């Protein structure tokens, strides 16, 4: 009979730890309090076109690169369904 | 209220209307992206989101077998302010349109 | 049990904490409730402390033969869960207050200072908003409690927080609560001088020893603490810490349980007065029916007004209240290791005290000096 | 038109079909008074429009721990009636 | 007004194909290209590129519904007035003394 | 909204996250995450009453052209936009930060 | 030991693990009082000894229309608390 | 014509043959109910369309690490069904 | 060592590295819970050990149409998780 | 033992638990003289024995219109004290 | 218009809805001289305005122990008549 061999890690989990996206900081929450009389302020909104502001448009020009003439056929791509099995909890609001 | 799916449908309609036969050209292309950003902004005005500031960003580029990543982390009021995006991609270029609608108090 | 019923109606008749199902329901409601303020955490902390006190009273009053081991470990685990969840909710409320107040990294407020004083928890928060290296003396307003932070901490984006809630704990007792000193991140390394105030309910007959909590070792330790100075007139303890953490003042656990004399005299048939004179104080205690009260304190022949005076309660809560106030005249089983005693036979003591209490309604009894010179099997006392 | 405001508590959804879930629950509350028929109306309409293997929980006092596929979870209140709509399968 | 940092919002992800000849992966690229060309050329052993079926076995989901038992809901009103108390007591004592007299005969 | 301050924050975040690293698409996603997370954290540490929208474009230097245009709509006296382009021998990084007053 | 009688209402199950659901509900009502925590305990326990996703609905007033795998539907009352437990995934 | 909205998550094609992947999947979802036959229809059609070295997976809960040809990768959702289409060789 | 039974469904190699695929899939199921990671681990190690030209896909609900090499095709179950692994380069 | 005869006026109840209400009222009047503590003692014993959703009104002059669960309404006389004990919740 | 003052002894409600309890009680005292009809008027007005399962206790001697929902409790005097109004269900 084939004995269940002890699993031997083979280095391909290291690239998974490289590829996994981890959030460095916790989600930051800010509360700002304003009086209700200042809500519904009169609106002074204006268009800012990309042609009107120099910083609104940034262009990287194209050039013929002779280094990138090696046409591989071989990109390794990983994908998944949107993560977490989502064992989520809902409760009715108890008075 | 800002509706991301309806905004995405309108953005997709404009992207399919304009970029269906559009190939890569660096001469006409900055004017094209400025026009696309202004036009998407103006059609989100014509949808009529009251008390909503509008942020529209368009990133288009050449297709040659390249590596591109587009993402955003933002800081808004999650109950009123919301966002959407669309991607067009043809034989010669790739286009990303990101819309962020922020309610004003 | 009936008194539990009565004061349960009087204080928390609406929430119903007495049943274990509703206690777990309380754990449940605190998990459901979010963004709890410090006042809400305090208002429910009264219920938490009532539940812990009731469980402790059950464990101390129900005999061990009637107490199942499952019941004992369940009540102890409930007490520990209540304490840990309560401290977690204080931490959550403190984080809510910090993110309410601090907001910006600099806040344009110079140096945020907040002092919150309660019966059980006293909080001091200071934020380094200016990041001024020349400002190293952090002194809270209206108090002498403060710190002397280094220049790196005076330039860093920190807040210094005080939360006032290997040491052989059989030899030393912890007094005055726990002062949690922390450096929190604001939303070459010299020791930091910390000046604290001793709790007024604690009488230190000697200089208190400053000890810090080794959390990895899970015990109190005397290392890492220097520049220890005590001002008894101002009740101020100044000491230098290498690393911040939980810090408490300790004294030797067995210092005032030894005493000189005693006298149990009847006031009525159903009432007696026990006067116990120690080296430091004369404690008069009145016993009537199932209640005992602290009649009087003579601190070195000076009358001392105590909060416990005038309040009748059952004997084991009376012992607990006197021990918490520092008037510990009730020895433990290990008290003979550190107290010079005239150890008698326990059976002789039990029979003698039973007949003592039987005759206490009409006979006054007094301490005999020949008790010390009679042997262990015999007891000598004065009667009238 | 019953004036029952949709109070969205938790919604791993997209916003158009958040409105569709609100509209279908509004039609289900108006047409049916038993919560099993309200859950029948919301789930079946989400079976035809957004593929089978949905699940709907309708009631005023229920606590759930449910596994849902992603972008297919909403739990909201229509008046005092709580509607839990998640998809698994 | 509560402002909260949002999550990862990826709008576009184009993996590269163009790897430089000066890059460290270029020789692995060239060997992979040669191996893929060799595979596309050779079909020697039996059906080398035989297309095969596979399917996960899961599901078979059927329908049964649940409705909770409805607690029947009833209004009720009472009369606690002392005059009604004494009149009721007089009524029951009167009927008790009325029924107690019929057993002697 | 100070455009120079926002540009300095964006440049610091880009240099802290990407650095002098070459192009690796397995790490492009993590670099994209870290740039905008650091930018958003520093903008909230500035703490001015602005909702912040920070977007990142990361582009392999293979000779293919890229650009970024933003046509937006606000109260132009108070709110602002700042787009910063950074590059190394192998990378392009275009980060746009929009602050919108409350 | 809370004397709450298990009243099986609808169950396409096998009889051995109907006792497992009753015992798991009896344990969950004893330790927990939130119905989603009871739904958390019953589903997670059923997740470790059967494997697929599972879904637990606990409450006193809810109506459901759910799609379950074969031999994987049970609904019962533990006293006045109704526990719905179906497997789908 | 089932109203399953084509949501493209990751694409490396042209619009001529992103749309071809959308319509062939829509034909394959309508014609076949088993995911292996849906993948059979998609790859067979694209083997005769863009050379016979494609690969297709049809399903709802899966993840892959695949190697793809230049301008020959796409991963999209046709409603709730996740479909990968990559050409290798 | 998670005792997940290896039920080999379609074996088309030698027995030695059928065992390696079972052993490799055991490694990824123990340190990871995401099927993309489980697909990434088996693919690249098989890239590292049996030429850099493999393909792996892992999930619970997925049915494919794939092209492989003779003596380079497996599809097996490690517990409930279905793992398909094939070389097409 | 006080010979307070129980007069039942309106009891939507069972017979065994009408007696439980009478006996619990008998110990409540004996232990407590204030009607708010009599209502406290009757309610909790009914809260503990059956369900923690009872309500008790004790007095000599009060007119109420309360909404009760069926088989959970009693209004009886114990001497000159009127006790309304109904369950709602 | 009788000048019957409203002193609020206990109130777990909001101010606009405590006032509605006072105004409805003033109307109920005016039309009805009988406390149950006063209690029937206040409760049924509160049933249609702030959902069902309200309870009204009106009288001149009553000691109560009742369970109420949060922000749904009042105990007040209108002249010499104490009126207790709480919601439960």
């Amino acid at each position: 009979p084939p004995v269940s061999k002890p699993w031997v890690s083979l280095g391909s989990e290291k690239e998974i730890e490289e590829e996994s996206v981890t959030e460095s900081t916790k989600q930051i929450t800010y509360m700002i309090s304003r009086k209700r009389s200042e809500f519904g302020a009169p609106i002074k909104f204006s268009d800012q076109n990309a042609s009107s502001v120099k910083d609104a448009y940034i262009e990287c020009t194209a050039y013929p690169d002779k280094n990138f003439t090696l046409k591989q056929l071989e990109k390794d791509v990983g994908m998944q369904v949107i993560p977490q099995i989502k064992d989520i909890s809902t409760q009715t609001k108890w008075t | 209220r800002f509706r991301p799916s309806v905004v995405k449908d309108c953005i997709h309609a404009v992207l399919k209307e304009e970029l269906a036969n559009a190939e890569y050209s660096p001469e006409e292309m900055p004017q094209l992206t400025k026009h696309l950003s202004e036009n998407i902004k103006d059609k989100l005005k014509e949808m009529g989101f009251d008390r909503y500031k509008m942020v529209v960003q368009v990133v288009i580029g050449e297709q040659r077998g390249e590596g591109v990543f587009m993402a955003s982390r933002c800081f808004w009021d999650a109950d009123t302010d919301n966002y959407t995006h669309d991607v067009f991609m043809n034989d010669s270029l790739f286009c990303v349109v990101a819309a962020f609608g922020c309610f004003y108090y | 049990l009936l008194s539990q019923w009565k004061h349960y109606i009087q204080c928390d008749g609406s929430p119903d904490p007495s049943v274990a199902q509703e206690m777990n329901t309380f754990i449940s409601l605190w998990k459901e409730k979010t963004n709890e303020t410090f006042e809400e955490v305090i208002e429910k902390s009264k219920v938490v402390l009532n539940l812990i006190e009731k469980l402790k009273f059950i464990l101390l009053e129900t005999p061990p033969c009637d107490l199942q081991d499952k019941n004992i470990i369940q009540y102890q685990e409930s007490i520990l869960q209540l304490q840990e969840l309560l401290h977690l909710k204080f931490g959550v409320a403190t984080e809510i207050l910090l993110k309410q107040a601090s907001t910006l990294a600099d806040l344009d407020s110079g140096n945020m200072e907040k002092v919150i004083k309660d019966e059980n928890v006293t909080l001091y928060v200071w934020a380094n908003l200016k990041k001024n290296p020349r400002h190293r003396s952090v002194r809270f307003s209206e108090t002498q409690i403060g710190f002397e932070i280094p220049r790196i901490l005076a330039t860093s984006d920190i807040a210094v927080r005080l939360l006032h809630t290997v040491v052989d704990l059989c030899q030393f007792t912890t007094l005055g609560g726990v002062y949690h000193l922390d450096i929190l991140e604001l939303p070459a390394f010299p020791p930091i001088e910390v000046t604290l105030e001793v709790h007024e309910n604690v009488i230190f007959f000697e200089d208190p020893v400053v000890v810090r909590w080794d959390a990895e070792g899970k015990h109190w330790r005397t290392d890492g603490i220097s520049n220890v100075s005590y001002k008894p007139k101002e009740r101020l303890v100044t000491f230098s810490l290498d690393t911040f953490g939980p810090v408490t003042l300790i004294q030797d656990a067995h210092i005032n349980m030894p005493y000189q004399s005693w006298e149990l005299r009847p006031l009525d048939v159903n009432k007696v007065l026990l006067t116990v004179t120690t080296v430091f104080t004369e404690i008069q205690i009145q016993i009537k029916e199932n209640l005992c009260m602290l009649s009087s304190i003579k601190l070195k022949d000076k009358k001392h007004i105590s909060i416990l005076e005038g309040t009748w309660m059952t004997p084991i809560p009376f012992i607990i209240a006197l021990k918490e106030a520092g008037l510990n005249i009730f020895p433990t089983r290990h008290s003979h290791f550190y107290v010079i005693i005239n150890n008698k036979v326990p059976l002789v003591e039990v029979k003698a005290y039973r007949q003592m209490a039987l005759l206490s309604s009409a006979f006054a009894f007094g301490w005999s000096k020949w008790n010390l010179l009679c042997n262990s099997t015999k007891v000598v006392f004065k009667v009238r | 038109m019953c004036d029952r405001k949709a109070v969205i508590k938790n919604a791993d959804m997209s916003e158009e079909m958040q409105q569709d879930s609100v509209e279908c629950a509004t039609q289900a509350l108006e047409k049916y008074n038993i919560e099993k028929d309200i859950a029948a109306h919301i789930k079946k309409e989400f079976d035809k429009k957004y593929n089978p293997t949905w699940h709907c929980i309708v009631g005023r006092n229920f606590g759930s721990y449910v596994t849902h596929e992603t972008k297919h979870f909403i739990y909201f209140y229509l008046g005092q009636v709580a509607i839990l709509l998640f998809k698994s399968g | 007004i509560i402002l909260t940092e949002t999550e990862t919002l990826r709008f576009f992800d184009l993996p590269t194909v163009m790897v430089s000849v000066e890059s460290e992966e270029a020789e692995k690229v060239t060997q992979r290209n040669k191996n893929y060309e060799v595979l596309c050329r050779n079909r020697l052993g039996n059906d080398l590129y035989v297309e095969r079926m596979m399917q996960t076995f899961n599901g078979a989901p059927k329908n049964k519904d649940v409705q909770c038992d409805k607690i029947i809901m009833e209004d009720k009103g009472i009369m606690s007035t002392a005059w009604d108390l004494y009149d009721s007591y007089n009524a029951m004592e009167l009927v008790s003394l009325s029924v107690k007299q019929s057993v002697v005969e | 909204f100070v455009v120079d301050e926002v540009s300095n924050i964006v440049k610091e975040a880009i240099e802290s996250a990407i650095g002098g690293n070459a192009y690796q698409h397995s790490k492009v996603n993590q670099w994209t995450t870290n740039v905008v997370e650091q930018t958003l954290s520093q903008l909230t540490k500035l703490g001015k009453p602005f909702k912040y929208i920070v977007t990142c474009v990361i582009m392999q230097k293979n000779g293919a052209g890229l650009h970024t245009a933003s046509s937006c709509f606000w109260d132009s006296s108070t709110d602002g936009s700042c787009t910063v382009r950074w590059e190394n021998k192998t990378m392009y990084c275009i980060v746009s930060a929009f602050g919108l007053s409350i």
Side-chain angles (χ1 to χ4, degrees), chain A, chain B, chain C, chain D, chain E, chain F:
Chain A
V3 190
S4 68
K5 287 188 180 178
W7 59 277
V8 178
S9 173
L10 283 162
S12 62
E13 319 206 19
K14 191 178 165 182
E15 66 162 7
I16 293 157
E17 284 302 320
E18 296 162 4
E19 268 182 359
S20 50
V21 180
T22 49
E23 289 186 358
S24 68
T25 46
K26 287 185 181 177
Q27 292 189 1
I28 51 176
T29 308
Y30 276 78
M31 72 291 291
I32 303 165
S33 67
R34 202 181 183 180
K35 289 185 179 181
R36 189 168 177 161
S37 60
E38 301 182 6
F39 279 82
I43 306 165
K44 47 173 79 67
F45 287 175
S46 60
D47 284 318
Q48 201 202 50
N49 294 327
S51 315
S52 56
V53 175
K54 189 181 174 181
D55 288 334
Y57 179 70
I58 280 184
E59 168 191 0
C60 310
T61 49
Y63 50 92
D65 206 336
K66 296 179 183 178
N67 291 332
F68 292 83
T69 58
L70 164 62
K71 187 183 176 188
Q72 66 182 357
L73 279 297
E74 289 90 7
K75 175 52 67 177
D76 299 330
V77 55
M79 52 185 208
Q80 184 67 63
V81 184
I82 297 169
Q84 184 62 256
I85 202 175
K86 291 279 194 56
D87 286 14
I88 199 154
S89 65
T90 69
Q91 184 64 65
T92 50
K93 270 192 179 180
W94 303 338
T95 50
Chain B
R1 196 181 169 179
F2 187 84
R3 291 188 178 181
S5 300
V6 192
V7 170
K8 180 183 179 175
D9 290 341
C10 203
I11 284 174
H12 183 73
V14 159
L15 286 189
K16 191 181 174 180
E17 179 193 348
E18 195 271 316
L19 284 163
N21 299 326
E23 281 184 359
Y24 180 74
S25 172
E27 308 91 12
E28 59 87 27
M29 172 155 208
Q31 290 283 335
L32 193 61
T33 311
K34 288 175 188 175
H35 181 74
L36 281 175
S37 67
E38 289 156 14
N39 189 359
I40 291 162
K41 185 195 62 173
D42 291 344
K43 70 182 184 62
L44 299 195
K45 309 295 170 288
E46 293 173 5
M47 293 177 70
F49 298 124
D50 194 33
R51 305 201 165 267
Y52 265 99
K53 308 172 182 180
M54 202 44 243
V55 169
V56 173
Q57 191 184 205
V58 185
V59 178
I60 307 170
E62 192 177 9
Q63 276 211 51
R64 279 190 178 172
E66 69 276 341
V68 185
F69 196 77
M70 186 66 204
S72 170
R73 273 63 158 180
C74 318
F75 177 70
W76 68 72
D77 191 357
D79 288 327
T80 56
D81 303 333
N82 190 358
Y83 80 105
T84 193
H85 76 282
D86 200 35
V87 171
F88 190 89
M89 161 156 278
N90 58 10
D91 268 320
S92 200
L93 56 89
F94 62 94
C95 168
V96 178
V97 176
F100 317 94
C102 302
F103 185 80
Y104 178 67
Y105 311 99
Chain C
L1 292 169
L2 267 297
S3 304
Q4 282 167 357
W5 203 100
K6 307 313 167 217
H7 76 279
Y8 151 75
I9 300 299
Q10 266 82 71
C11 82
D12 50 17
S14 311
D16 301 332
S18 54
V19 176
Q21 301 178 359
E22 277 80 4
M23 182 295 268
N24 306 343
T25 300
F26 284 162
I27 310 298
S28 311
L29 302 199
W30 309 337
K31 286 166 179 169
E32 269 163 352
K33 195 179 180 180
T34 48
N35 303 352
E36 293 180 354
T37 80
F38 207 85
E39 295 86 9
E40 293 176 336
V41 177
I42 279 176
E43 280 305 308
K44 216 64 162 175
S45 85
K46 294 160 183 164
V47 189
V48 171
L49 289 170
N50 176 41
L51 273 168
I52 289 160
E53 190 187 60
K54 279 178 177 186
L55 287 170
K56 283 172 175 180
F57 285 169
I58 287 162
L59 289 171
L60 286 167
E61 289 172 323
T62 308
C65 49
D66 303 330
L67 265 180
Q68 294 186 356
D69 291 331
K70 184 261 294 178
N71 292 338
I72 294 174
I73 65 156
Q74 183 207 294
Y75 302 155
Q76 285 176 323
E77 280 169 352
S78 302
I79 284 166
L80 288 173
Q81 281 175 19
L82 279 160
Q83 287 167 321
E84 286 168 356
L85 185 49
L86 184 55
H87 190 85
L88 177 64
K89 290 287 186 167
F90 285 116
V92 163
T94 311
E95 191 207 326
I96 289 156
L97 180 71
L98 277 177
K99 73 173 67 75
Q100 271 164 344
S102 74
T103 314
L104 284 73
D106 49 351
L107 181 53
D108 294 331
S109 294
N111 261 341
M112 183 278 288
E113 190 209 318
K114 184 62 175 176
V115 178
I116 299 175
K117 294 188 175 191
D118 205 76
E119 181 184 13
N120 303 295
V121 168
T122 300
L123 175 68
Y124 304 81
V125 183
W126 173 85
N128 187 31
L129 304 163
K130 270 302 177 183
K131 318 171 211 180
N132 196 5
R134 291 180 270 192
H135 198 194
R136 290 186 299 164
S137 192
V138 174
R139 293 290 167 177
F140 296 101
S141 298
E142 310 173 348
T143 61
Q144 299 298 109
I145 289 168
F147 320 107
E148 301 294 324
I149 56 174
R151 285 185 179 177
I152 172 160
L153 289 193
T155 47
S156 300
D157 291 331
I158 66 168
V160 191
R161 181 187 76 167
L162 158 62
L163 187 76
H164 177 207
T165 56
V166 184
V167 173
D168 191 12
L169 290 182
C170 300
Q171 185 185 353
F172 297 93
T173 180
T174 62
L175 289 174
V178 183
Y179 306 86
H180 305 266
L181 302 158
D182 305 282
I183 309 164
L184 316 169
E185 299 195 343
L186 183 61
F189 309 106
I192 316 163
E193 193 185 276
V194 182
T195 305
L196 303 179
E197 193 170 359
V198 192
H199 207 89
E200 58 183 355
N201 299 6
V202 167
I203 300 168
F204 274 118
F205 310 100
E206 306 188 336
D207 286 347
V209 179
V210 193
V211 304
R212 62 164 186 87
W213 181 252
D214 191 14
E216 290 87 4
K218 298 190 174 185
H219 46 54
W220 299 104
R221 290 183 62 98
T222 62
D223 59 348
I225 302 154
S226 63
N227 201 251
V228 180
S229 184
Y230 182 44
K231 297 179 182 175
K233 330 291 166 288
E234 303 159 19
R235 282 180 155 260
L236 286 180
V237 180
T238 308
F239 56 93
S240 299
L241 294 174
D242 303 353
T243 310
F244 278 179
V247 176
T248 195
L249 307 178
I250 63 158
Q251 197 178 247
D252 50 350
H254 304 72
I255 186 167
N256 213 0
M257 283 74 75
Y259 69 97
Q260 317 160 327
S261 58
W262 52 268
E263 180 187 14
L264 180 76
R265 58 184 196 90
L267 304 174
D268 291 331
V269 188
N270 190 265
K271 200 181 187 185
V272 289
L273 169 72
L274 175 60
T275 299
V276 179
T277 307
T278 77
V279 184
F280 297 99
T281 174
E282 185 201 300
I283 296 178
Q284 294 187 17
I285 293 162
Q286 281 170 15
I287 307 164
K288 186 262 292 179
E289 194 39 54
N290 61 326
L291 308 176
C292 309
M293 61 79 71
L294 173 68
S295 186
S296 75
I297 301 176
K298 299 179 187 154
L299 282 184
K300 306 177 182 175
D301 308 313
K302 288 189 178 180
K303 280 193 172 189
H304 185 74
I305 299 171
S306 174
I307 307 158
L308 303 179
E309 289 189 345
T311 304
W312 295 90
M313 73 291 291
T314 45
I316 287 168
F318 180 82
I319 291 164
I320 292 158
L322 264 66
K323 282 182 179 189
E324 286 178 346
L327 296 173
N328 188 13
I329 53 164
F330 312 99
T332 78
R333 303 196 177 156
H334 305 103
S335 288
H336 75 285
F337 289 125
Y338 296 101
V339 177
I340 54 170
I341 78 167
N342 181 207
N343 199 32
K344 303 300 194 184
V345 172
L347 186 60
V348 176
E349 273 191 56
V350 161
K351 291 177 177 188
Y353 291 150
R354 279 183 178 186
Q355 300 181 87
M356 262 293 178
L358 281 161
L359 295 164
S360 69
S361 62
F363 295 92
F365 310 96
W367 162 78
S368 174
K369 81 189 198 183
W370 294 99
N371 198 46
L372 188 62
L373 296 189
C374 72
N375 45 16
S376 188
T377 59
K378 298 170 186 179
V379 294
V380 179
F381 40 83
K382 297 190 291 184
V383 76
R384 69 172 170 101
Chain D
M1 186 66 204
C2 64
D3 185 28
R4 294 178 182 177
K5 192 179 177 180
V7 181
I8 311 284
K9 179 251 204 177
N10 203 336
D12 185 26
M13 293 296 174
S14 60
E15 278 283 337
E16 172 199 356
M17 181 275 287
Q18 274 175 213
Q19 188 65 39
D20 298 352
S21 64
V22 164
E23 283 164 4
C24 188
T26 310
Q27 294 160 18
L29 289 202
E30 281 166 356
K31 192 176 176 179
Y32 307 102
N33 63 6
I34 316 174
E35 292 96 354
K36 70 161 178 179
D37 302 323
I38 297 152
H41 183 92
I42 299 166
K43 182 258 181 188
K44 280 176 181 174
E45 282 281 326
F46 270 67
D47 271 0
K48 315 315 158 200
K49 190 167 178 180
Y50 311 93
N51 292 320
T53 69
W54 275 87
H55 318 278
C56 190
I57 315 295
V58 175
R60 301 166 178 259
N61 180 276
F62 64 96
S64 82
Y65 202 73
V66 295
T67 289
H68 69 86
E69 303 187 25
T70 49
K71 290 201 171 177
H72 293 87
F73 164 75
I74 192 168
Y75 171 66
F76 63 97
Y77 294 84
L78 205 47
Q80 191 177 3
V81 175
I83 295 92
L84 167 66
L85 181 62
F86 74 103
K87 193 209 54 165
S88 186
Chain E
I1 299 157
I2 300 181
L3 295 205
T4 306
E5 176 179 4
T6 62
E7 291 190 350
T8 284
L9 323 172
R10 298 165 193 170
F11 295 158
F12 190 59
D13 185 15
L14 176 57
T16 197
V17 180
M18 294 298 102
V19 183
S20 170
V21 293
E22 303 174 356
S23 169
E24 205 181 353
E25 297 174 358
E27 78 280 357
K28 294 179 193 173
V29 164
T30 314
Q31 190 58 42
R32 275 182 182 167
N33 272 337
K34 291 177 187 175
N35 290 344
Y36 285 17
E37 284 162 9
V38 162
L39 192 72
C40 287
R41 282 180 267 156
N42 302 343
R43 208 185 193 265
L44 309 172
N46 198 5
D47 304 346
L48 186 46
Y49 318 124
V50 58
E51 307 161 345
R52 311 201 95 175
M53 301 326 89
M54 73 292 291
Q55 176 64 52
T56 61
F57 38 94
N58 51 1
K62 60 192 188 93
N63 290 318
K64 308 197 271 168
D65 61 307
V66 160
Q67 172 60 43
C68 274
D69 297 338
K70 186 178 175 178
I71 306 166
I72 309 169
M73 188 66 203
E74 185 176 356
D75 294 345
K76 207 61 174 175
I78 64 172
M79 281 335 297
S80 169
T81 45
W83 172 46
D84 291 345
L85 270 286
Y86 293 107
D87 291 356
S88 288
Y89 295 146
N90 290 334
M92 51 204 98
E93 300 322 301
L94 272 164
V95 305
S96 66
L97 65 92
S98 307
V99 304
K100 270 190 176 179
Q101 269 176 340
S102 63
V103 291
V104 190
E105 287 200 351
Chain F
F1 195 85
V2 182
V3 186
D4 293 330
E5 196 178 27
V6 171
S7 179
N8 290 338
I9 277 175
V10 164
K11 283 179 186 173
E12 214 176 355
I14 289 172
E15 286 178 2
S16 174
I18 297 174
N21 290 315
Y23 177 78
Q24 289 187 12
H25 190 73
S26 53
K27 298 180 178 175
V28 167
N29 198 351
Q30 186 63 51
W31 294 328
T32 303
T33 302
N34 293 345
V35 165
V36 293
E37 274 183 357
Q38 284 170 356
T39 304
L40 210 59
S41 184
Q42 294 298 324
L43 284 170
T44 51
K45 278 178 186 172
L46 289 189
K48 309 177 184 177
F50 286 103
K51 304 172 184 179
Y52 291 113
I53 296 163
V54 184
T55 79
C56 182
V57 192
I58 280 180
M59 192 46 257
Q60 188 194 24
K61 269 193 169 180
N62 69 327
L66 188 88
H67 60 255
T68 296
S70 62
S71 292
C72 307
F73 179 75
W74 58 85
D75 195 354
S76 294
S77 53
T78 60
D79 313 325
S81 68
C82 172
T83 314
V84 179
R85 174 190 164 193
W86 176 90
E87 64 180 11
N88 64 24
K89 292 179 184 176
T90 56
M91 282 335 297
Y92 288 115
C93 184
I94 304 171
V95 173
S96 314
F98 312 93
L100 305 92
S101 74
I102 303 157

